[PDB]
Structure 1
Amino acid sequence: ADVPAGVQLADKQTLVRNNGSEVQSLDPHKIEGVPESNVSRDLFEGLLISDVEGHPSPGVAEKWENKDFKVWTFHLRENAKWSDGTPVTAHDFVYSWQRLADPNTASPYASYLQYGHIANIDDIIAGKKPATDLGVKALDDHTFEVTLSEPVPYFYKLLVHPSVSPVPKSAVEKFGDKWTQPANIVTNGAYKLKNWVVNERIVLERNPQYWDNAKTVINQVTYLPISSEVTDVNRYRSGEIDMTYNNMPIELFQKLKKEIPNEVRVDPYLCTYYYEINNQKAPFNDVRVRTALKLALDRDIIVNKVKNQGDLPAYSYTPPYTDGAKLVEPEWFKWSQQKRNEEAKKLLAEAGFTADKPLTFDLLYNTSDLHKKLAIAVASIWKKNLGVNVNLENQEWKTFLDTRHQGTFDVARAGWCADYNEPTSFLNTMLSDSSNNTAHYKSPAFDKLIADTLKVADDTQRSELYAKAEQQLDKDSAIVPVYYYVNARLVKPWVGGYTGKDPLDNIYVKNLYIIKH
């Protein structure tokens, strides 16, 4: 943290953050969500990290070079260490990226290496080549070299993500799935794991072996697993919680803006809220059905009547304010809702649905006040506008993600947040073979458009290709875009260091501090 001249620090430097749900895991190779990544940035540090405004900055690598954007050389700081005092080396990164690529690890983020195009990744994922053929090598203990199959000018931006953080081979090998328990875990971020009580709390304590430990101010941070946004706000206003999770409740928000304006932080956020359709499951494998659901959802009502928290109605998957996004707003989004409803009704009538044999399906969402209220509203809107019946089903976060990967569900509530600020951080998830493709969407035309983006050496042609890829997604009604999120949360007046300037919201507790109050 960089404490401004003149601020008086509190005697006790402890922080309590709500984290939205119980994490799936603390293993960087087994996680995919926001809550997981929140804890992951405090414990495991990769080659680069985000600074307080979100700019990619030195992490374990102090400096780096590239040759033709295809060979990237990272110079690792000599004093980078794990919490047991041992050095973090380039061998740790070789092992870790191999483990991430290895199909036996079954990481949800195995395709992150395809997104960066590390050499030989496709064959490794397919089981055609061993993970040791991955295009990474340690040239020495402090030098990590990555070789890609084609120029990727934004490659370094991907490196702040948890999936490419290092993991300690000896703990993984000796303890297997229990390597992340407090007694066994070894970490290289600013914090160490002190306590992990499932569905109660995660408590982290400062890691004195961290190379930048002298700048760390918070000594202990607790992450809570509260999925009820109302309860989160309640425990924040009671004094227990210092920073809520950034999912806000419909019951109280309007009230909060009026009652505590200075504590309500609302900043840009590169995330899209949408209803994920299982594209491989009839009758959702019919574009007419999917298009009807997309058109009959009334975004004006959701965004301004039922939620009204500053979200913008969405018509795409990639947020239009992503760096590099120049999207074409489709004609259906400018229509009146009445016109969208008649088109939807006509497609559904064309697909075979009648009043006597209506379309009935499930709407899966993870436990949440917000998601429940929004799914009840969406069910009502679809019932009134299109005559479809939906059966709401809630699941806890970890189960919910498992269900979507299992891919036999019908429609699921969904939200994707950028991992790096560039449209492929969204678009690569819809590639036929992506490990993150829970839409189960497979379009050869879409895949080709994205493949073509690194075959041009021009940002203008790349942007035009991303716009066409979004148009192809839209044409196929792969998803139901609802709204672009805003990062809205409460932060006590005494919490310093949270700028809200990073649109990816990659917070590091090592950057925060408690002001005397």
Structure 2
Amino acid sequence: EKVLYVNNENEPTSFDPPIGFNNVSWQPLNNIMEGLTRLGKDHEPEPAMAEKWSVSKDNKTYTFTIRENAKWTNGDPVTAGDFEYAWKRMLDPKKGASSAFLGYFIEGGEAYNSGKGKKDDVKVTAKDDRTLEVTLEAPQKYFLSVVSNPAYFPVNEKVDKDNPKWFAESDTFVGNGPFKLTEWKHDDSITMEKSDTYWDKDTVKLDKVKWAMVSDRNTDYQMFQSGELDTAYVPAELSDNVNIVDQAGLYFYRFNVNMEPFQNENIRKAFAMAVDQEEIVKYVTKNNEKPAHAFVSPGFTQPDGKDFREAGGDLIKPNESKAKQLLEKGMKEENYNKLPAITLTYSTKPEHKKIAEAIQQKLKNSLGVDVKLANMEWNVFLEDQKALKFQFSQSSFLPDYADPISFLEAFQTGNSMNRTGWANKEYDQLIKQAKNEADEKTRFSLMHQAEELLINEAPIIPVYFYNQVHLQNEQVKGIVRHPVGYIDLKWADK
């Protein structure tokens, strides 16, 4: 028996596909479910549930043919109807999926989600059981990548109506991906087995994947040294076994611009300019992460061949003396003799505590500001963050497709990925313009203009750009970790 041993670190938020919208949920979900496409070894979308597609001359209407003999774990056929149902479901305002904006690529999607349009004016329709037609608002070169995103995964319509909570346990789960969910001990472990109903089961070489939920990267490393894990993190305080692989996105902090004292732009800028991202990566993380002096990470090539982040340059760098000046100026503007109490809230986990402590110490040392730390587990932390309950909070962004607009759309007014209360009409206009811009050089210019404005008003503090550095059992081969998107294990062997 070949059993791959990995660590998920924590409990998935949700296995209802559009709901989790995070690594902890979607790393495992990506291996028990499947979209129309799946990203391959070269990170390009390849036929998965769709065996092929046709695109109209105007580049807006995609017609997908569903694989013959694609089946759910319960033996039901995977139909075009399951995709139509799932996509209209994810857009349903009553559902409140944070990922619903990803459905706005579909004509009528934004209108439906916003209550200004009808469900059946969302332009996704099953023409027959094996034919799915979708019309986009505008051409989208990354659409075939987007439909590998878990938000776009099908749901078995029959199963969903019979039991609307099917996704909540292994016993009731019905999936269509390379592995079958066979055990889910909440907060302890996940087990999945090679799925004997899967269309491409002959490709799948592993018998089982077991997912631990060990949140201490030190205990992780110990489990790797003892042989209990096939893959593991590299501990900061340590330094052929090691695999360095890119991952777009960043670690950052959010302010709430409607909670004192962060209504004042100078106070926000002061805090942002106090943080020294190089010190964080050099003295805390220590996994060769790039310090983040902007929001959009490395990895996005421009029309001119340059990297977007390289071309844009640093937008925010530590400047202690200027920070002190701006804090003084902002406090005077608000008639503050002393700053109101500030709490920095992070999600309960050793790395987040160690970074929050560094930020706490730096703010004290640079500005003389005392912040108190608070923490809660990710699942409720995320709910509270979305609800705008935190003054100042640990934040993470992974792009959903491989373009800077994935990052920049986050900070539109009221966006599910904003969570700061920041509401800049000029920013909103730049994003709208970029979303409607067919000329790529122009579109890139608009995106740099937007990013400069975002960083200038400092509703956020960028900290560091991600990567995926791991130890791996040399007897495991063929794990595919993508720069944008979730781990693929279907090709792996041991």
TM class, shorter-length: over 0.9
Aligned-partner Cα distance in 1 for 2:272–2:335:
16
Show the counterpart of 1:504.
484
Specify the alignment match of 1:314 in structure 2: 292
Q: Please, what TM-score do these two structures have when normalized by structure 1?
A: 0.90
Query: 1:317-363 deviations in whole A, cap 9, x for unaligned?
Result: 11132344624225653xx6344444444444444476x61343111
Give the conservation status (yes or no) of the 8 Å contact 2:479–2:488. Answer: no
Moved more, 90-99 or 223-232: 223-232
Instruction: State the secondary structure of the residue aligned to 1:424.
Output: helix
Find the partner of 1:413 among 376, 382, 394: 394
The size of the alignment, in residue pairs, is 487
Query: Is 2:90 the counterpart of 1:73?
Result: no
**Helix, strand or coil: the match of 1:510?**
coil
Which of 78, 82, 94 lines up with 1:92 in the alignment? 82
Which of 430, 450, 465 matches 2:446? 465
CA contact (8 A) 2:331 2:339 kept: no
Matched, 1:45 2:25: no
Residue 305 (structure 2) pairs with residue 305 (structure 1)? no
Which residue of the partner structure matches residue 366 of structure 2? Answer: 385
Matches within 5 A, 1:438-477: 438-477=419-458
Give, in angstroms, the shift of residue 498 of structure 1.
2.7
1:427 is paired with a residue of what secondary structure?
helix
2:308 counterpart SS class: coil
Question: Aligned residue for 1:329?
Answer: 313
SS of match in other structure, 2:246: strand
TM-score (norm 2): 0.94
- Give 1:493 shift: 1.3
**Could you tell me which amino acid in structure 2 is paired with residue 103 of structure 1?**
P
Q: Which runs of 5+ in 1 are unaligned?
A: 1-11
Q: Contact 1:152–1:454 at 8 Å: present in 2 too? A: no
What's the counterpart of residue 109 of structure 1?
99
Residues 235 and 429 (structure 1), Cα distance of their counterparts in 2 relative to 1, 3 Å cut: same
Please state how far the C-alpha of 1:468 moved relative to its aligned partner: 1.0
- Partners of 1:211 and 1:435 in 2: how far apart? 35
Deviation at 1:178, TM superposition (A): 4.1
Q: Which residue of 2 aligns with 1:123?
A: 111
The answer to whether the aligner puts 1:270 opposite 2:258 as a matched pair is no
1:35 to 19, 24, 33: 24
**Is the 2:149–2:485 Cα contact (8 Å) retained in structure 1?**
no
Deviates more, 1:132-141 or 1:344-353: 344-353
C-alpha change, 1:284 and 1:449, in structure 2 (3 Å) is same
Tell whether 2:34 aligns with 1:19: no
Relative contact order (C-alpha < 8 Å, sep 6+): which is higher? 1
Structure 2 counterpart SS, 1:127: coil
AA partner of residue 329 (structure 1): G
Q: Does the CA-based 8 Å contact 1:230-1:369 persist in structure 2?
A: no
Cα distance in 1 for residues equivalent to 2:5 and 2:345: 30
Cα distance in 2 for residues equivalent to 1:310 and 1:179: 37
- In 2 relative to 1, CA 331–61 (structure 1 residues): closer, same or farther, beyond 3 Å? closer
**Equivalent position to 2:274, from 281, 284, 296:** 296
The answer to whether the Cα contact below 8 Å between 2:293 and 2:315 also exists between their aligned partners in 1 is: no
Matched, 1:169 2:157: yes
CA distance in 2, matches of 1:505, 1:98: 22
What letter is aligned with 1:285? Q
Contact 1:22–1:397, Cα closer than 8 Å, also in 2: no
How far does the alpha carbon of each residue in 1:265-303 deviate from its partner, in whole angstroms, 9 at most, with x for none?
A: 222210211112223333222211211111011122112
Contact 1:365/1:412 (8 A) holds in 2: yes
Is residue 82 from structure 1 mapped to residue 63 from structure 2 by the alignment?
no
Tell me how far apart the structure 2 counterparts of residues 376 and 231 of structure 1 sit (CA, whole Å).
21
Kindly tell me: are residues 445 and 81 of structure 1, through their superposed partners in 2, closer, same or farther at Cα, counting changes over 3 Å?
Answer: same
SS at match of 2:4: strand
2:146 to 131, 138, 158: 158
Contact 2:166 2:174 in 1 (8 A): no
Query: CA–CA distance in 2 between the matches of 1:207 and 1:390?
Result: 50
Q: 1:323 to 1:44 in 2, by over 3 A?
A: farther
* 1:507 to partner: Cα distance: 1.6
Matched, 1:57 2:46: yes
In 2, Cα distance between equivalents of 1:45 and 1:151:
24
Q: Distance in 1 between matches of 2:113 and 2:279?
A: 43
Once residues 227 and 331 of structure 1 are traced to their aligned partners in structure 2, the CA distance between those partners, rounded to angstroms, is 33
Give percent identity, aligned residues only: 30
CA distance in 2, matches of 1:353, 1:413: 28
Q: Name the CA distance, whole Å, in 2 between partners of 1:510 and 1:50.
A: 11
Counterpart for residue 283 of structure 1:
261
**Cα gap change, 1:217 to 1:344, in 2 (>3 Å):** farther
Aligned partner letter, 1:507: I
Partner of 1:472, secondary structure, is helix
Q: Which amino acid aligns with 2:84?
A: V
Q: What code does the residue aligned with 1:193 have? A: L
Shift of 1:427: 1.5
CA distance in 2, matches of 1:284, 1:368: 26
State the alpha-carbon separation in 2 of the partners of residues 347 and 299 from structure 1.
Answer: 24
**Which residue of 2 is the match for residue 207 of structure 1?**
195
Q: 1:216: which partner in 2?
A: 204
Deviations 1:343-391 (A, max 9, x none): 444444444476x613431111112211111110110000111122111
Unaligned runs of 5+ in 2: none
Q: Is the CA contact 1:281–1:408 (under 8 Å) kept in the aligned structure 2?
A: no
User: Which position in structure 2 is the counterpart of 1:394?
Assistant: 375
RMSD: 1.9
Question: In the aligned structure 2, how far is the partner of 1:362 from the partner of 1:266?
Answer: 35
Which of 410, 429, 433 is the matching residue for 1:429?
410
Q: Which residue of 1 aligns with 2:183?
A: 195
The aligned amino acid for 2:384 is T
SS of the residue 1:192 aligns to = strand
Whether 1:239 and 2:227 are equivalent positions in the alignment is yes
For residues 136 and 249 of structure 1, do their structure 2 counterparts lie closer, same or farther at Cα, with a shift above 3 Å needed?
Answer: same
* Corresponding position: 1:369 with 2:350: yes
Alpha-carbon distance in structure 2 between the residues aligned to 1:179 and 1:312: 37
